[PDB]
Design a binder for this molecule. Structure first.
Ligand SMILES: OC[C@H]1O[C@@H](O)[C@H](O)[C@@H](O)[C@@H]1O
Ligand SMILES: OC[C@H]1O[C@@H](O)[C@H](O)[C@@H](O)[C@@H]1O
Ligand SMILES: OC[C@H]1O[C@@H](O)[C@H](O)[C@@H](O)[C@@H]1O
Ligand SMILES: OC[C@H]1O[C@@H](O)[C@H](O)[C@@H](O)[C@@H]1O
Lengths: 436, 436
């Protein structure tokens, strides 16, 4: 069922999940997308420490169970997040230190895992235990001050609480191999394995942005941890800008590492993101698929069996043999595009950007002046509107992000001068394109 | 002066105004920008028919006077918007017809203009009286059904009501000279001038978007009406996507016409816009100046001593004599830019886009990883964030939109390999750039 992220991921034995927020489950648009696209669920906040143990010794699973029930009800496995962490600790825990904190950490793990015993596929036992100062050492928190062995203790406690769950160490900024933090985490997991400390996986949050950009060496990082005898998972994926290339690259990295169990993006729609300003997810506020959604789906499905048009190129219609053409090489905003004999001309060289735009002349964009059938497809100053974003379907169709409509050669026309419009996708030859 | 739009416009005897919303006058972030940048004000809603005459014969000028007083007290003239219009009429007027409506229209004009007699620079006496059906004729409204001469009567009444006020006919989609609507309005004004009908100006709302895009012939339209002996004014300008080039083009069109009194943009910040989703104004919601802002200011100040960049070229540091270079022509996100001997290489060719990006390799963007002094300037996948948008000042500095900080050669370095960072603008030579 290569039409959804989860089903496509399953074609390689992997899963594709998202972070679910219980307060959004009543939003039909939200749940429709969530239930359809993912087969793995992580509670975005409902299973955290402050949410599960409001007061010392007083557990509360109402919020967590809403997420859990929704997941199982809709056929999804669940990643528990998270048992031990320095952040978002309830007030009573923040006031703790030393052995009292250590026992509280232990009691919390037992309580929460006990409640979900045998129902959780993966547990992020310890979250973000390493520093960002740049040296790759432990993060100084009340937990770390109880003793360096707190992490090991948390894992030994978790294994005993629920031996059916895969135990993961989860963290961010550990994707680039050259980072000290990545290496500090590697050394710890290696040590655990060497000493029989029970740890089954390492979760790479994968929160990519210009401050901590994705880097191709991520594949070696995954390979390096996998070699230690642990599974690896991309746990909180989101990319600032939602670059199609970066999203596909990360997906391909996981598909290249047999031990990479799957990918979870941190949210459903950009508006649901903890960093919405970065529009880093696969669906926009409207609930529509972004250019990145298609890049990911295509990567999961193996991608095109030929070299993608790097540095721009022509877009030739299959049912007409003619290329996408801007009339008379005009640069006037509002000029509807047409079909025309292909040739070496700037007014026929289109470049698909990572943001999903189809640019010509360098700063002009394939633009749709509306969202319904017949809408004129023209060129307009590039600005990033969804009516300027396109998805390149593997079936050769090019769909408008905002409209969900396909580029369509009017009346099935095939001769030069044939104009281009938007139209309900029909899988027709006049809606199919082969690039060059 | 020339550091603000209003002052810059004043140098040529023109004005740069905005639409003021009375509800936001209590917002210091709003007023700080408004009082500083504009010298002309149009009440966004407080002077309309329904807002000034809630019931026939009962006038209410409280809200209108609030905006008017704020304008005058802060050094701004005022454009009255609007006296006769088919839209937003109070309920009672919407039910009138024939002679009774005609009389109500006249009484309204007399009541409002009498109240502001001698205090309004320009009055939009009649608003949007032409159809968008492509016929170039009058739109069918209760006002039109009272007789084709209603517009003429509205103007004659106005002149008598307040002879010191410049009387304008205001409409939208009358910018592209080839459009039938434009011709329709042109013929009318021409007729009025030949018959002595008291009309002094024509206001072009100038709402541009991919549906009704800006066209260079807008200057022809402006020149054509000016030739009729009437002044012209851009009254409600906003450009979908806030293209720098288009904003500058519209500005130059007005400067090219001796009769163009000035330019008013329909709002202060994008978040105050009736079309916020199109981010069509000059200021971001956070109050920061956008790429277009500087493009408009530069145009008002006479542009540059030399022809602007036609997309694609080097950026040479003034103090170093070296160019902005991406090390080893790397395309890796996170790569910090440096200074390096200038030469013909794609890793030194930057294209400034209308959106304010500085692109290299076609799809990589000059990126600021943060907003504080010392922030690293690098290349990152283009996505449109404000940390990827820049303003090209006429003084040679390049300012980050989001940060408000200048491109800066670290330590005033001049040698190859000197890194680029963000830093408080100092007018230093290591912060000024030019063309090779
Ligand atoms: O002038 C006829 C046609 O000639 C072709 O070379 C151009 O690419 C088309 O845009 C143009 O319409
Ligand atoms: O006839 C309405 C539309 O039907 C679609 O199937 C065709 O692909 C379009 O070109 C046509 O305009
Ligand atoms: O190899 C040293 C330098 O050579 C120049 O040609 C490149 O443009 C620089 O980016 C590079 O750092
Ligand atoms: O004081 C440190 C900073 O001073 C500024 O004046 C310089 O332009 C910067 O390059 C420098 O890093």
């Amino acid at each position: 069922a290569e039409s959804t992220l989860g089903a496509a991921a399953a074609q390689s034995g992997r899963y594709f999940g998202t972070a679910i927020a219980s307060g959004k489950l009543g939003d039909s648009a939200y749940t429709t997308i969530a239930s359809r696209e993912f087969n793995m669920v992580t509670a975005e906040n409902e299973m955290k420490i402050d949410a599960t143990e409001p007061q010392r010794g007083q557990f509360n699973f109402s919020a967590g169970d809403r997420v859990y029930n929704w997941a199982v009800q809709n056929g999804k496995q669940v990643r528990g997040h998270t048992l031990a962490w320095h952040s978002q600790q309830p007030g009573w825990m923040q006031s703790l230190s030393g052995s009292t904190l250590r026992q509280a950490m232990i009691d919390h793990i037992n309580g929460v895992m006990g409640h979900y015993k045998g129902k959780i596929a993966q547990w992020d036992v310890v979250n973000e235990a390493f520093s960002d100062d740049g040296s790759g050492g432990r993060r100084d928190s009340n937990l770390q001050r109880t003793g360096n062995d707190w992490i090991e203790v948390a894992f030994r406690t978790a294994r005993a609480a629920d031996p059916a769950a895969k135990l993961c160490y989860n963290d961010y900024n550990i994707e680039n191999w050259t980072w000290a933090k990545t290496q500090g985490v590697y050394n710890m997991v290696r040590d655990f394995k060497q000493r029989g400390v029970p740890i089954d996986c390492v979760g790479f949050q994968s929160h990519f942005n210009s401050g901590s950009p994705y880097n191709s060496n991520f594949r070696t990082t995954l390979q390096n941890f996998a070699a230690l005898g642990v599974d690896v998972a991309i746990t909180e994926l989101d990319i600032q800008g939602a670059s199609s290339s970066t999203y596909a690259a990360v997906t391909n990295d996981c598909l290249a590492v047999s031990r990479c169990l799957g990918i979870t993006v941190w949210g459903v729609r950009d508006t649901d993101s903890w960093r919405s300003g970065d529009t880093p997810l696969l669906f926009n506020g409207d609930g529509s698929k972004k250019a990145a959604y298609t890049a990911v789906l295509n990567a999961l499905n193996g991608g095109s069996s030929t070299p993608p048009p790097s540095g721009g190129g022509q877009i030739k219609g299959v049912g007409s043999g003619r290329c996408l053409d801007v009339p008379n090489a005009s640069t006037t905003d509002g000029t509807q595009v047409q079909l025309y004999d292909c040739h070496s001309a700037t007014n026929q060289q289109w470049t698909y950007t990572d943001a999903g735009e189809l640019r010509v002349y360098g700063d002009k964009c394939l633009d749709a002046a509306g969202t319904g059938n017949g809408t004129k497809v023209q060129i307009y100053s590039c600005w990033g509107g969804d009516n300027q974003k396109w998805r390149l379907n593997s079936d050769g169709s090019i769909v408008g992000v905002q409209s969900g409509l396909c580029l369509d050669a009017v009346g099935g026309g095939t001769a030069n001068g044939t104009l281009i419009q938007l139209y309900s996708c029909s899988n027709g030859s006049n809606q199919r394109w082969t690039r060059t």
